[PDB]
Design an enzyme around this catalytic site. Structure first.
Site, PDB file in Angstrom:
ATOM      1  N   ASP B   8       0.875  -1.163   0.000  1.00 48.21           N
ATOM      2  CA  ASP B   8       0.000   0.000   0.000  1.00 48.21           C
ATOM      3  C   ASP B   8       0.922   1.226   0.000  1.00 48.21           C
ATOM      4  O   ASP B   8       2.080   1.120   0.416  1.00 48.21           O
ATOM      5  CB  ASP B   8      -0.912  -0.007   1.243  1.00 48.21           C
ATOM      6  CG  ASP B   8      -1.970   1.085   1.299  1.00 48.21           C
ATOM      7  OD1 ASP B   8      -2.260   1.698   0.241  1.00 48.21           O
ATOM      8  OD2 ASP B   8      -2.539   1.303   2.390  1.00 48.21           O
ATOM      9  N   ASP B  10       0.061   4.601   1.312  1.00 45.71           N
ATOM     10  CA  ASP B  10      -0.116   5.213   2.607  1.00 45.71           C
ATOM     11  C   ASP B  10       0.036   4.290   3.807  1.00 45.71           C
ATOM     12  O   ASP B  10      -0.644   3.266   3.889  1.00 45.71           O
ATOM     13  CB  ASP B  10      -1.442   5.948   2.686  1.00 45.71           C
ATOM     14  CG  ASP B  10      -1.392   6.828   3.892  1.00 45.71           C
ATOM     15  OD1 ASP B  10      -0.486   7.690   3.950  1.00 45.71           O
ATOM     16  OD2 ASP B  10      -2.113   6.532   4.868  1.00 45.71           O
ATOM     17  N   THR B 110      -3.023   1.251  -4.271  1.00 46.40           N
ATOM     18  CA  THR B 110      -3.402   2.378  -3.429  1.00 46.40           C
ATOM     19  C   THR B 110      -4.742   3.032  -3.735  1.00 46.40           C
ATOM     20  O   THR B 110      -5.151   3.127  -4.895  1.00 46.40           O
ATOM     21  CB  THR B 110      -2.251   3.410  -3.405  1.00 46.40           C
ATOM     22  OG1 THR B 110      -2.599   4.499  -2.546  1.00 46.40           O
ATOM     23  CG2 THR B 110      -1.868   3.926  -4.809  1.00 46.40           C
ATOM     24  N   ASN B 111      -5.398   3.525  -2.664  1.00 43.59           N
ATOM     25  CA  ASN B 111      -6.629   4.298  -2.726  1.00 43.59           C
ATOM     26  C   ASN B 111      -6.145   5.726  -2.810  1.00 43.59           C
ATOM     27  O   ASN B 111      -5.705   6.293  -1.807  1.00 43.59           O
ATOM     28  CB  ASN B 111      -7.508   4.080  -1.482  1.00 43.59           C
ATOM     29  CG  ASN B 111      -8.466   2.914  -1.571  1.00 43.59           C
ATOM     30  OD1 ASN B 111      -8.545   2.197  -2.574  1.00 43.59           O
ATOM     31  ND2 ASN B 111      -9.224   2.703  -0.509  1.00 43.59           N
ATOM     32  N   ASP B 172      -1.921  -1.179   5.979  1.00 43.81           N
ATOM     33  CA  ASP B 172      -2.033  -0.628   7.331  1.00 43.81           C
ATOM     34  C   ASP B 172      -3.489  -0.604   7.841  1.00 43.81           C
ATOM     35  O   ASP B 172      -3.725  -0.273   9.009  1.00 43.81           O
ATOM     36  CB  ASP B 172      -1.372   0.765   7.413  1.00 43.81           C
ATOM     37  CG  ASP B 172      -2.073   1.863   6.640  1.00 43.81           C
ATOM     38  OD1 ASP B 172      -2.531   1.595   5.508  1.00 43.81           O
ATOM     39  OD2 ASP B 172      -2.135   3.003   7.152  1.00 43.81           O
ATOM     40  N   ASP B 322      38.822  10.965 -14.782  1.00 46.75           N
ATOM     41  CA  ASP B 322      39.931  10.517 -15.618  1.00 46.75           C
ATOM     42  C   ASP B 322      40.238  11.531 -16.741  1.00 46.75           C
ATOM     43  O   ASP B 322      40.459  12.701 -16.432  1.00 46.75           O
ATOM     44  CB  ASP B 322      39.601   9.114 -16.149  1.00 46.75           C
ATOM     45  CG  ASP B 322      40.788   8.369 -16.628  1.00 46.75           C
ATOM     46  OD1 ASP B 322      41.553   7.912 -15.787  1.00 46.75           O
ATOM     47  OD2 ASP B 322      40.963   8.268 -17.860  1.00 46.75           O
ATOM     48  N   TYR B 370      52.747   3.538 -19.445  1.00 44.02           N
ATOM     49  CA  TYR B 370      51.682   2.985 -20.295  1.00 44.02           C
ATOM     50  C   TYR B 370      51.244   3.997 -21.359  1.00 44.02           C
ATOM     51  O   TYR B 370      50.762   3.589 -22.417  1.00 44.02           O
ATOM     52  CB  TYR B 370      50.484   2.525 -19.443  1.00 44.02           C
ATOM     53  CG  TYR B 370      49.764   3.677 -18.782  1.00 44.02           C
ATOM     54  CD1 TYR B 370      50.230   4.223 -17.594  1.00 44.02           C
ATOM     55  CD2 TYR B 370      48.656   4.265 -19.380  1.00 44.02           C
ATOM     56  CE1 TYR B 370      49.603   5.319 -17.006  1.00 44.02           C
ATOM     57  CE2 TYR B 370      48.039   5.375 -18.817  1.00 44.02           C
ATOM     58  CZ  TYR B 370      48.499   5.884 -17.615  1.00 44.02           C
ATOM     59  OH  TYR B 370      47.883   6.964 -17.026  1.00 44.02           O
ATOM     60  N   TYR B 453      45.379  10.224 -25.967  1.00 46.87           N
ATOM     61  CA  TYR B 453      46.767  10.184 -25.479  1.00 46.87           C
ATOM     62  C   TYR B 453      47.780  10.614 -26.536  1.00 46.87           C
ATOM     63  O   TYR B 453      48.953  10.817 -26.208  1.00 46.87           O
ATOM     64  CB  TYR B 453      47.145   8.747 -25.106  1.00 46.87           C
ATOM     65  CG  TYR B 453      46.384   8.158 -23.946  1.00 46.87           C
ATOM     66  CD1 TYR B 453      45.188   7.480 -24.147  1.00 46.87           C
ATOM     67  CD2 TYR B 453      46.913   8.186 -22.657  1.00 46.87           C
ATOM     68  CE1 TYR B 453      44.503   6.898 -23.088  1.00 46.87           C
ATOM     69  CE2 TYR B 453      46.242   7.597 -21.590  1.00 46.87           C
ATOM     70  CZ  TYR B 453      45.038   6.955 -21.813  1.00 46.87           C
ATOM     71  OH  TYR B 453      44.361   6.370 -20.785  1.00 46.87           O
ATOM     72  N   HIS B 511      40.818   3.436  -8.817  1.00 45.48           N
ATOM     73  CA  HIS B 511      40.718   4.344  -9.957  1.00 45.48           C
ATOM     74  C   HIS B 511      39.287   4.533 -10.466  1.00 45.48           C
ATOM     75  O   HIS B 511      38.925   5.643 -10.858  1.00 45.48           O
ATOM     76  CB  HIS B 511      41.638   3.884 -11.097  1.00 45.48           C
ATOM     77  CG  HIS B 511      41.506   4.714 -12.333  1.00 45.48           C
ATOM     78  ND1 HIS B 511      40.762   4.278 -13.416  1.00 45.48           N
ATOM     79  CD2 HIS B 511      41.980   5.950 -12.597  1.00 45.48           C
ATOM     80  CE1 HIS B 511      40.831   5.250 -14.307  1.00 45.48           C
ATOM     81  NE2 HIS B 511      41.556   6.274 -13.858  1.00 45.48           N
TER      82      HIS B 511
HETATM   83  O1  LIG Z   1      42.592   4.651 -18.510  1.00 49.01           O
HETATM   84  C1  LIG Z   1      43.796   4.572 -17.775  1.00 49.01           C
HETATM   85  C2  LIG Z   1      44.270   5.976 -17.796  1.00 49.01           C
HETATM   86  C3  LIG Z   1      43.739   7.149 -17.326  1.00 49.01           C
HETATM   87  C4  LIG Z   1      44.624   8.191 -17.703  1.00 49.01           C
HETATM   88  C5  LIG Z   1      44.492   9.611 -17.507  1.00 49.01           C
HETATM   89  C6  LIG Z   1      45.011  10.473 -18.456  1.00 49.01           C
HETATM   90  C7  LIG Z   1      44.888  11.838 -18.299  1.00 49.01           C
HETATM   91  C8  LIG Z   1      44.241  12.345 -17.190  1.00 49.01           C
HETATM   92  C9  LIG Z   1      43.720  11.487 -16.243  1.00 49.01           C
HETATM   93  C10 LIG Z   1      43.842  10.122 -16.402  1.00 49.01           C
HETATM   94  N1  LIG Z   1      45.652   7.696 -18.389  1.00 49.01           N
HETATM   95  N2  LIG Z   1      45.410   6.378 -18.424  1.00 49.01           N
HETATM   96  C11 LIG Z   1      43.455   3.978 -16.435  1.00 49.01           C
HETATM   97  C12 LIG Z   1      43.461   2.483 -16.672  1.00 49.01           C
HETATM   98  C13 LIG Z   1      44.375   2.223 -17.847  1.00 49.01           C
HETATM   99  C14 LIG Z   1      44.698   3.566 -18.455  1.00 49.01           C
END
Ligand SMILES: OC1(c2cc(-c3ccccc3)[nH]n2)CCCC1
Ligand SMILES: OC1(c2cc(-c3ccccc3)[nH]n2)CCCC1
Lengths: 534, 534
Positions: B8, B10, B110-111, B172, B322, B370, B453, B511
């Site tokens: 319900d 209410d 419900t009413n 109720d 990110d 990376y 990147y 992250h």
């Molecule tokens: O995505 C990842 C990553 C995130 C960034 C990043 C690059 C620029 C600014 C903030 C973060 N660079 N690289 C996290 C996991 C694998 C690579």
């Protein structure tokens, strides 16, 4: 020969000028002439103002310019008032709009700043409104160059892809006009707008001054935000979205599209509203299931509620025209909690007759005979789908341009039996606008749209449940003088069911209200939204 | 055996009860016991209240019930206060949420009334929040039937597609419980929520009371409003939209989606914001051009401005994570007039070093190796596209679940050289959630995302132009304790460039902030939005 026009923001496209202030501050506060407006210019090309105009620093960083003056003296307050008082010089924008319509490449070239003040939105809104009407917007703070420096003019020419002799340059500052003129551009010193436009008129050979009132801003389908919501498996609703603020849901009629609201979408968004212009079930990019029952008022209203649910909207103002107007009154009667306010163009609110079948009611009025022609599945679809260009050119016409009668449709055996194969293009529509409707109707055809008429008995039974109710939420009824189907008189007794009903009336207006009289529609709707819908 | 649960509104899903008022009004105003609450019930099944509950009349029509009492007495005021005080009974909704997650078919019976008061939005918002969590919502005023009438229970059973013995019914009011019980349904008289839940727990055999705090509401992609904007020919941006109010633009990181914000979207919308969760350029349903230069910060920011332009938004609050966090700081530095407020999760704001090349800066920090592996076009794409399920299962992991090192990536020759072929499913993600990312990445792959990147030098040159500026608009920095790439310490000197910077910190958070700690993210963001973004 010219094909490009360049306008300054300050003192040209926006009035009063930024420096009209100062001259006014000095005078009003009885300060020495030029003190303020010269301390502002201190250091010249190496000064704080040039750094600001080049985008090196922000407006808030520049505020402490800084630099006997009283206790109640603030540069922040003087500048806030100056920026807020500055409005679009409508005749100047209208002239720019005319030149662009006539094939010109238009641009805004301005000495501006990166605005980070708490009240920056005011200027952001102004720039957003202006920029949409021009091919380019060149801001000093974005390019790192300023007027009068010769580099910005070479940049301007590069962006325009035109030789100096092909460009008109309008500016209120002689110093900033000089480099354009010495490169070979046509220049205009803007003092009063009228003489500046006389000079622009003489040079271009295009009428800019005292021209008939232009149509409101329309929509280019590819420049719109297109939204898609699945209301149930196999049923998706498409809409065009523009603006921020209270949600305004626009519902078109038969045989239309979201595009029927093209003149209202930019206007209402500019007025401070979030416009959601629908492609109703069976139309355009929305789903078109074949079953008749999928188009009864109860299902259509339930799906509009789901649409709000999935978009996370508790309420929306519902504005409808034609069949859209009908749905809109039923949204107010069955779901008042989800309707902020309700408005209908042409469609009156008539409570269902519980003692008379809707087929008896329709037969009693000869204007509604086309509805009986629309009953048999396949018949009207075949006629309307035969030639799409002919269908829209015959229907979308002003009160004086009539080609179809709508009476004795069943006896004659169709809507277009008295109609030409190649109808003339109506004053309300361009060939391109007609082709948009043609392309939208190629997807699903007329089965879905016509099914809206195939639920007379179902809709009647559902409406009878609301016979004891009254519409007590804000409501507006807009009547069109020359609508020979949805006559203004049909609305006469609505106050009995909607006591607080507000009204609007459009003279010399046919059935296609939105495209027939766009300026008047926008004016009535904005006035009502601002007073009754917040 | 049971598979359905009915609640319900209410006194069950919403507290305090509607009639808790009256009892309180009579007491407070020293009026005879039951006078008010009996005059309300006058006429019984043929009375004004039954007509209201059946949807024959609206709440405003019912207000003049009507029926010595003082001058300062108003039914409108008593009812306004009663409806406004009524909030969702969170433990009851949590129990309903648990039963549904465990396979139960849930419903609200419900009413209720058709609310047409000026303050109807309050209830519309409450119903909108509740209804999304249930399979069905059966309202008396919509079906034309009321509790305790036997017909509504037969309707309930029909809608549920379940036999009485398969249904739990919570109410109720004893009178409204009786017909459910006599048909063979399991019934619970709701007095205090705790004993009602103990009874619900015993009967279902599912733990409802004292269960660990549940995750915030997530998003089902097919139940969302999907928006599409063309920012330039061949470049279209996709977004998911939910809620009304100030526009909040969510910007994901690498290699993510709009779906990375799934726990924030319903929460922020519920908090009174218009959420626009982006699929950033190169991701999901957004366009993914192959050219590297299409992904430099300058182009990406310009396209986000065009996105606001085409949607008719002068401003939006920009929340990024990110790479999204990086873009978001650059939106504040280059377009402060278009940014209402700025917030970043994990990504600090570090001004560009004008004396050091970005390649020198990246080589100086081993955590960023990376990024060097990501430089050569095709290399990282091949590894990341090889097995999509493996890619997402390896990446989307909590701080304690680590499988990849991120150090010596180039020397080792890949991100997954130390990683298993079949990684275990992380506690943050379900198999279905992983498959969504798999399906989105099948369209364009990793070329576009990785190109973010591949503009180190381009981004560095552009950022150097903003070196004299400061971020003076409302700003929030949220640090994640266990993010071993975007460490909380990297943010230490931000106050030098953002003096009024506000902060948030999440302990035991990796992250993937949004899915790691959704409840804490929502809490920090809502608190900051309500105080700094309006
Ligand atoms: O995505 C990842 C990553 C995130 C960034 C990043 C690059 C620029 C600014 C903030 C973060 N660079 N690289 C996290 C996991 C694998 C690579
Ligand atoms: O679309 C037309 C039309 C419009 C309606 C209508 C039906 C119900 C309510 C309001 C209007 N019925 N028919 C106008 C041109 C040809 C048919």
């Amino acid at each position: 020969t010219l094909r490009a026009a360049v306008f300054d923001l300050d003192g040209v496209l926006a009035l009063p000028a930024v420096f009209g202030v100062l001259g006014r501050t000095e005078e009003a506060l009885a300060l020495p002439r030029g003190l303020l407006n010269d301390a502002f210019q201190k250091g010249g090309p190496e000064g704080a103002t040039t750094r600001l105009m080049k985008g090196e620093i922000t407006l808030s960083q520049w505020i402490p310019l800084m630099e006997c003056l009283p206790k109640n003296f603030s540069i922040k307050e003087i500048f806030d008032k100056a920026i807020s008082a500055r409005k679009i010089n409508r005749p100047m924008l209208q002239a720019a709009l005319m030149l662009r319509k006539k094939g010109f490449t238009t641009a805004i070239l301005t000495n501006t700043w990166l605005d980070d003040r708490a009240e920056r939105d005011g200027l952001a809104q102004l720039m957003c409104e202006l920029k949409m009407h021009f091919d380019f917007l060149i801001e000093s703070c974005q390019v790192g160059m300023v007027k009068p420096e010769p580099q910005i003019y070479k940049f301007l020419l590069d962006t325009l892809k035109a030789s100096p002799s092909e460009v008109v340059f309008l500016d209120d500052i002689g110093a900033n006009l000089k480099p354009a003129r010495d490169l070979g551009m046509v220049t205009i010193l803007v003092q009063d707008t009228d003489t500046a436009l006389k000079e622009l008129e003489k040079v271009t050979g295009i009428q800019l001054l005292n021209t008939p009132a232009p149509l409101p801003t329309s929509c280019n389908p590819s420049d719109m935000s297109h939204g898609y919501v699945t209301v149930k498996p196999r049923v998706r609703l498409h809409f065009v979205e523009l603006g921020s603020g209270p949600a305004v849901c626009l519902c078109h009629g038969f045989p239309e599209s979201w595009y029927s609201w093209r003149y209202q979408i930019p206007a209402l968004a500019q007025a401070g509203y979030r416009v959601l212009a629908m492609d109703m079930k069976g139309y355009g990019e929305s789903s078109a299931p074949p079953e008749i029952e999928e188009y009864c008022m109860e299902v259509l209203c339930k799906e509009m509620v789901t649409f709000l649910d999935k978009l996370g909207l508790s309420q929306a103002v519902f504005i409808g025209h034609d069949w859209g107007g009908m749905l809109v009154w039923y949204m107010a009667l069955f779901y008042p909690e989800r309707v902020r306010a309700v408005a209908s163009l042409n469609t009156p609110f008539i409570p269902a007759n519980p003692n008379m079948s809707p087929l008896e009611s329709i037969k009693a009025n000869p204007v509604f005979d086309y509805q009986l022609y629309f009953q048999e599945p396949g018949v009207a679809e075949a006629e309307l789908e035969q030639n799409l260009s002919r269908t829209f050119k015959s229907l979308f016409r002003a009160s004086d341009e009539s080609v179809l009668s709508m009476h004795k449709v069943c006896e004659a055996g169709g809507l277009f039996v008295n109609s030409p194969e190649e109808p003339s293009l109506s004053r309300m529509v361009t060939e391109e606008e007609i082709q948009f409707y043609v392309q939208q109707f190629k997807k699903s055809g007329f089965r879905g749209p016509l099914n809206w008429y195939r639920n007379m008995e179902r809709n009647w039974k559902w409406a009878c449940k609301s016979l004891g109710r009254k519409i007590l939420i804000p409501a507006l009824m807009v009547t069109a003088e020359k609508d020979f189907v949805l006559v203004p008189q049909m609305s006469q007794h609505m106050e009995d069911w909607i006591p607080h009903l507000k009204r609007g009336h459009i003279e010399d207006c046919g059935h296609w209200t939105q495209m027939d009289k766009p300026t008047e529609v926008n004016q009535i709707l904005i006035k009502w939204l601002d007073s009754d819908a917040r």
